[PDB]
Design a protein around this nucleic acid. Structure first.
Ligand code: MG
Ligand code: MG
Ligand code: MG
Ligand code: MG
Ligand code: MG
Ligand code: MG
Ligand code: MG
Ligand code: MG
Ligand code: MG
Ligand code: MG
Ligand code: MG
Ligand code: MG
Ligand code: MG
Ligand code: MG
Ligand code: MG
Ligand code: MG
Ligand code: MG
Ligand code: MG
Ligand code: MG
Ligand code: MG
Ligand code: MG
Ligand code: MG
Ligand code: MG
Ligand code: MG
Ligand code: MG
Ligand code: MG
Ligand code: MG
Ligand code: MG
Ligand code: MG
Ligand code: MG
Ligand code: MG
Ligand code: MG
Ligand code: MG
Ligand code: MG
Ligand code: MG
Ligand code: MG
Ligand code: MG
Ligand code: MG
Ligand code: MG
Ligand code: MG
Ligand code: MG
Ligand code: MG
Ligand code: MG
Ligand code: MG
Ligand code: MG
Ligand code: MG
Ligand code: MG
Ligand code: MG
Ligand code: MG
Ligand code: MG
Ligand code: MG
Ligand code: MG
Ligand code: MG
Ligand code: MG
Ligand code: ZN
Lengths: 86, 50, 122, 24, 104, 134, 59, 135
RNA sequence: CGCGACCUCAGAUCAGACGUGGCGACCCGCUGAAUUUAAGCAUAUUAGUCAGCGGAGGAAAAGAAACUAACCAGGAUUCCCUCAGUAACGGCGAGUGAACAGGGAAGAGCCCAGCGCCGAAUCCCCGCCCCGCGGCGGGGCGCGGGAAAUGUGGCGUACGGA
RNA sequence: GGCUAAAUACCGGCACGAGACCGAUAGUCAACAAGUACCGUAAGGGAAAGUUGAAAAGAACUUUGAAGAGAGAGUUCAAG
RNA sequence: AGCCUUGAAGCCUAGGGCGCGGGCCCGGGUGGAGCCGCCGCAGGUGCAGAUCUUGGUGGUAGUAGCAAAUAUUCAAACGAGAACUUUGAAGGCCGAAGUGGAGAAGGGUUCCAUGUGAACAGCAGUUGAACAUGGGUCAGUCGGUCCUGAGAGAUGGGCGAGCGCCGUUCCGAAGGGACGGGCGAUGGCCUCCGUUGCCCUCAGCCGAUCGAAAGGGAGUCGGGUUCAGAUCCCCGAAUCCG
RNA sequence: CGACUCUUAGCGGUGGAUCACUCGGCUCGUGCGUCGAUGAAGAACGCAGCUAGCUGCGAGAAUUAAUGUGAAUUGCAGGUUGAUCAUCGACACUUCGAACGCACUUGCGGCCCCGGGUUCCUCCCGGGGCUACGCCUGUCUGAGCGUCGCU
């Protein structure tokens, strides 16, 4: 009775949606995230998890600040200057 | 669960709006490569994770 | 009329607020017309109203923040929004005068022994 | 419906099963 | 060919029994690539036999005297009449085959 | 050959820069030669076509000596539509047959201030090239 | 009405009172499975709901 | 000394690596003091440190920390190299003296294992094939 | 007991600044195996290697001898060819394994404490005026406030110096 | 006790250039809405999938059938 | 000075053949855009097997099977079409620890209406939890929110090369609170009081914080209303706290 | 000539092999070599007239302003004193997140200033600015049977 009859007792949840990585890997009893380690100040990443690196890198998401950092870098980070009006 | 939370209800609310199919004008464009919505989640087939 | 950003800059702030409120009433009426079922002229007009609201708020924000930096230009301490927002490692550098600050002994060396201009013969 | 997983392994003919045994 | 080509997939072999061909197969999953076969040159996807390296001996050096001998032979055969046509050049109307022109 | 090490001589990259060009480069690519009379008059080899231009079709099925007005310039499919260059659908409606602007000659230009500025700038560059060649 | 989800009942009451110039008896809020906040604004009986609906345009 | 952080014995392997008690840490306790002070103060930067006292159970070190951000250091050209971002956390890379004494770097026949940049640069420079073009 | 200094230690949503975390191919500091080989295996080997941890920069590190040599002496550091699979290490087994010098790429040198001379001759912050203010700097006016003799600045550092 | 460019390294990022390479079971897992769909409580695992025509010119209209389906007619050089 | 939209590669061929052979060349059809001979060069260069990898398709085979829990019958309607849809009548079953009416976890639009019979519901369907358009969850009183339990977990401290770990009262100056009195400053018919600023004076607590939608926890019931919501909407009665 | 079975050929179906194409990879080389409390990487949720996914953006939400370009976007409707595109230097950038008022339920606070309420009279509502830890310089308030000087 370790299989089909024992699968019916699975209703209480241990993990839930995390609020830093977004994945459903936030354990409720230990109060920590198994994906990124949310109560830790640092991101949980490893070099044995080489494929799990590239799922979450800088090239993955939006880069809503880093692309305009690159755009300001390619003209030398000018600030306050305006082009010549008509 | 009838006892929902706001975060879980908002997460279900986004998926309920994603569950709708494509319109009929989207395959009349020039460079169309979409015949149908391939991300149609049914409530019996895929259980949304969790 | 076509609300352009050129004539919004010379006008007074209260006229900008009155035109903003008129555009908000116009947006609310077009949303009511969309939900009741309206004309495609109104359905294309709501985008023009949204872009006009964006233009009016942009001109208001320009006339606010350039006047604020004109006010805080002469002062030594200025707010963090008015401070120049560049990269953090470039903000945490040395100053231009501090990169030119040399010691007295190094200035004495540069005075007594400059790198001479010379050439040799074949 | 997604791709069904492969037919699972079932210890069918070990020492535990008396339905068939070899010469011992 | 890149060294990561084929080795990014984790695949343990199923062992014996299972009546499968004793190949490292993809560890589970509800997808098409699950128990399929990743490593090996004969499997679909994965790696190929003998990945070509960046440190192949691409360049060959020749002795300087052999290089100069090749230059001297290539210049000396450009004066004989039969060897130029056997290269293929239409030279029937050329007045002299060592064609030397002025410095203008 | 090309001697600039930054100009691309790659087929896939040139096809990428062609078929993924923004609209101001689409206008630059979709240009058409002028007629012999307009070319002698303005000393301009070619110009980008506009919605209000006149066209003789040079190559294709609809070629001839028929001067037709452009309906509109459709830069997404790299094509223009001409007034009398059209065909009949099965149901009966007339659909303008698309012509690429490379098989298109201009008989009359629609002259605005920017159009005259581009023509004068091209004539000036042609005169500078002719003076440098002389 | 359909309301942004970040609102309060007092915010909906003062918003209806400032926009449409009408007094409010109470506000009942729910959040739809679409995501937006449906608001049943019970008015005072001195003004008519059908008259203010004909004023704003809905019918 | 530093003991091996393992459960009771249980260093799973060959009898070379079963040593747990008599192991020694590669850096000195003065450099441990420097890196602890520099980890407590990320803004302050370690210059060097010195011994003041020792017990049987403790040693005691004064670590000199410098602001790279105060004007008396920033406007002084003799110490403005401290204000440069290259010298961020010298105590971890081993750029202070107590860390440089643990690196085993120097000139001559007694320091062949750190010729080049460091010991790691020495090992990497020695363990490469220089597979040339024309060979 | 009261008042006033100094020394240690607190409390501040005090005035002005900084650090936290990410990427991590290259670089630095630790920690660190077992597969494997030795036709077994335990020293060795894989190997200061994989994994783990911390820290930056556009390079990092190193770096101007408590050096190499023993020659008619060379002369900071880094990298390449060669030394050289050599000297040497190793159940002297399996295997491991540099350095000097020579030819080049590059080449740039220096500053303190101490020892001493100069009325602390030095540094930070706040008030006013002028210039400039999108790398908050220069000069003048303040019986303004502090830091500093438990030592700031100038001359000066092994090539001698005063 | 301390500082210092240069020659040196770079499978991350931005902008590029080239190829005696591969040509959709190959080449990066990913030429396409690819770290997507999907699976596992989780750490993690992880696909398949390019080609009408030059131009939709994507078959008007008649007719059997409830329609899917056809039979004529029509477009195209070619609906083989 | 090769072949080619006056038809390249690929593919099929009861055709003509050549070479011992590996293989190759012509004839006919399909095809629509590139291809080959010779001298050299280079390789990811030749399949019948590896319980080979991927994809596809046969015999089995129209076969095994659609057999657990007593049972359906007649007429009418919609409809092209009815054993299964709907209504009426008859006969049955679950026989109040139910096949009934409601909740928790979980599911997430599956709830309701309209239309469809392309795909699914291992027969069918005019039907459905399927598909496509639209709608639906209204609270001071019902819960969460508050408290604490078993426990978890910061600060001080200790340890640790280090991310950090231990520890919860233990090597802590751990309070920012309030009665009264004095002083100056404001506000209101400066009456009299509140607000704040300083000083005197007073004070024990216990460990920051989290931790139960069944524990403790103030206070809402009756009637009516929707295709789908009712202690929530409407009416009539109350009631708790500030 | 029957049915069934075997072989070959024409044709038609299952299937997508071969060939030819390639806005894609792989490798090598060059220049630059820049993130973040002035709030990074990442995540969540919203934004289109008809908009699921992708892409882009942040309540100004498939974009605002400025410059250059010079008559369009387009699947369907709607409307030269500058449409659309690219550059982007100005403005703006919801909520988590180093994440910062304490917790992560979107819950509970505290201080100051404004508008309804008032006629400062305390609640209530709405808006705005602060309130994370460590550390550097200085300031203020302090403690000490620590070292002293005066009465
Ligand atoms: Mg549990
Ligand atoms: Mg880390
Ligand atoms: Mg299920
Ligand atoms: Mg000096
Ligand atoms: Mg492969
Ligand atoms: Mg050129
Ligand atoms: Mg060993
Ligand atoms: Mg060690
Ligand atoms: Mg150094
Ligand atoms: Mg020593
Ligand atoms: Mg402060
Ligand atoms: Mg860091
Ligand atoms: Mg062995
Ligand atoms: Mg062996
Ligand atoms: Mg063994
Ligand atoms: Mg070793
Ligand atoms: Mg490592
Ligand atoms: Mg950097
Ligand atoms: Mg350096
Ligand atoms: Mg040397
Ligand atoms: Mg030799
Ligand atoms: Mg021996
Ligand atoms: Mg070794
Ligand atoms: Mg040497
Ligand atoms: Mg001195
Ligand atoms: Mg020296
Ligand atoms: Mg020294
Ligand atoms: Mg030294
Ligand atoms: Mg080249
Ligand atoms: Mg494919
Ligand atoms: Mg394919
Ligand atoms: Mg193919
Ligand atoms: Mg592939
Ligand atoms: Mg095909
Ligand atoms: Mg054909
Ligand atoms: Mg045959
Ligand atoms: Mg073609
Ligand atoms: Mg090849
Ligand atoms: Mg085969
Ligand atoms: Mg049958
Ligand atoms: Mg049967
Ligand atoms: Mg029931
Ligand atoms: Mg029920
Ligand atoms: Mg239903
Ligand atoms: Mg069926
Ligand atoms: Mg703990
Ligand atoms: Mg609680
Ligand atoms: Mg409870
Ligand atoms: Mg094909
Ligand atoms: Mg395929
Ligand atoms: Mg949308
Ligand atoms: Mg604009
Ligand atoms: Mg413009
Ligand atoms: Mg709670
Ligand atoms: Zn997480």
């Amino acid at each position: 009775t370790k299989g089909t009859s024992s699968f019916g007792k699975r209703r209480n949840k241990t993990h839930t949606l995390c609020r830093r990585c977004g994945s459903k890997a936030y354990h409720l009893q230990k109060s920590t995230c198994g994906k990124c380690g949310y109560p830790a100040k640092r991101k949980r990443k490893y070099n044995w998890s080489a494929k799990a690196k590239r799922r979450n890198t800088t090239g993955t998401g939006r880069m809503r600040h880093l692309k305009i950092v690159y755009r300001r870098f390619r003209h030398g980070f000018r600030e306050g200057t305006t082009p010549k009006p008509k | 669960s009838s006892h929902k939370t706001f975060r879980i209800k908002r997460f279900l609310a986004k998926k309920q709006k994603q569950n709708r199919p494509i319109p009929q004008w989207i395959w009349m464009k020039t460079g169309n490569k979409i015949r149908y919505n391939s991300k149609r989640r049914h409530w019996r087939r895929t259980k949304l994770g969790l | 009329a076509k609300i352009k950003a050129r004539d919004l800059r010379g006008k007074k702030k209260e006229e900008l607020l009155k035109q903003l409120d008129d555009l908000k009433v116009e947006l609310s009426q077009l949303r009511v017309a969309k939900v009741t079922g309206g004309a495609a002229s109104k359905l294309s007009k709501i985008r023009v109203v949204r872009k006009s609201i964006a233009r009016v708020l942009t001109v208001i924000n320009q006339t606010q923040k350039e006047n604020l930096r004109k006010f805080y230009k002469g002062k030594k301490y200025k707010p963090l929004d008015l401070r120049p927002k560049k990269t953090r490692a470039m903000r945490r550098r040395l100053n231009k005068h501090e990169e030119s600050l040399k010691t007295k002994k190094q200035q004495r060396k540069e005075r007594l022994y400059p790198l001479r201009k010379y050439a040799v013969k074949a | 419906d997604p791709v069904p997983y492969q037919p699972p392994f079932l210890c069918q003919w070990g020492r535990h099963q008396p339905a068939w045994k070899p010469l011992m | 060919v890149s060294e990561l080509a084929g080795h990014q997939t984790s695949a343990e072999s199923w062992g014996t029994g299972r009546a499968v061909a004793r190949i490292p197969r993809v560890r589970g999953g509800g997808t098409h690539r699950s128990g399929q076969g990743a490593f090996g040159n004969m499997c679909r996807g994965g790696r190929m036999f003998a990945p070509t390296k960046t440190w192949r001996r691409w360049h060959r050096r020749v002795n300087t005297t052999q290089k100069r001998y090749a230059i001297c032979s290539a210049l000396a055969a450009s004066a004989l009449p039969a060897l130029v046509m056997s290269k293929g050049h239409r030279i029937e109307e050329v007045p002299e085959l060592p064609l030397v022109v002025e410095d203008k | 050959m090309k001697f600039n090490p930054f100009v691309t001589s790659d087929r896939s990259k040139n096809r990428k820069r062609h078929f993924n060009a923004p609209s101001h480069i689409r206008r630059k690519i979709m240009s058409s030669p002028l007629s012999k009379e307009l070319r002698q008059k303005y000393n301009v080899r070619s110009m980008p076509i506009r919605k209000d231009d006149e066209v003789q079709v040079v190559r294709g099925h609809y070629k001839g000596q028929q001067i037709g007005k452009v309906v509109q310039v459709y830069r997404k499919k790299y094509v223009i539509y001409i007034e009398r260059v059209q065909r009949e659908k099965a149901n009966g409606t007339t659909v303008h047959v698309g012509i690429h602007p490379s098989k298109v000659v201009i008989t009359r230009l629609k002259l605005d201030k920017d159009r005259k500025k581009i023509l004068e700038r091209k004539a000036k560059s042609r005169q500078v090239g002719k003076e440098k060649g002389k | 009405f359909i309301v942004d989800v970040k609102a309060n009942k007092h915010q909906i009451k003062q918003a209806v009172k400032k926009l449409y110039d009408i007094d409010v008896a109470k506000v009942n809020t729910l959040i739809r499975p679409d995501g937006e906040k449906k608001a049943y604004v019970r008015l005072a009986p001195d003004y008519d709901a059908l008259d203010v609906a004909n004023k704003i345009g809905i019918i | 000394g530093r003991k091996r952080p393992v459960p009771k014995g249980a260093t799973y392997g060959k009898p070379v690596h079963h040593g747990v008690n008599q192991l020694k840490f590669a850096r000195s306790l003065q450099s441990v003091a420097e890196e602890r002070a520099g980890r407590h103060c990320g803004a302050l930067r370690v210059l060097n440190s010195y011994w003041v006292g020792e017990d049987s159970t403790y040693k005691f070190f004064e670590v000199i920390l410098i602001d790279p951000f105060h004007k008396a250091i920033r406007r002084n050209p003799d110490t403005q190299w401290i204000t440069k971002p290259v010298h961020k956390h010298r105590e971890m890379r081993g750029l202070t003296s107590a860390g440089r004494k643990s690196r085993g770097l120097g000139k001559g026949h007694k320091f062949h294992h750190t010729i080049g940049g460091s010991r790691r640069a020495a090992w990497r420079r020695r363990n490469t094939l220089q597979l040339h073009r024309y060979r």
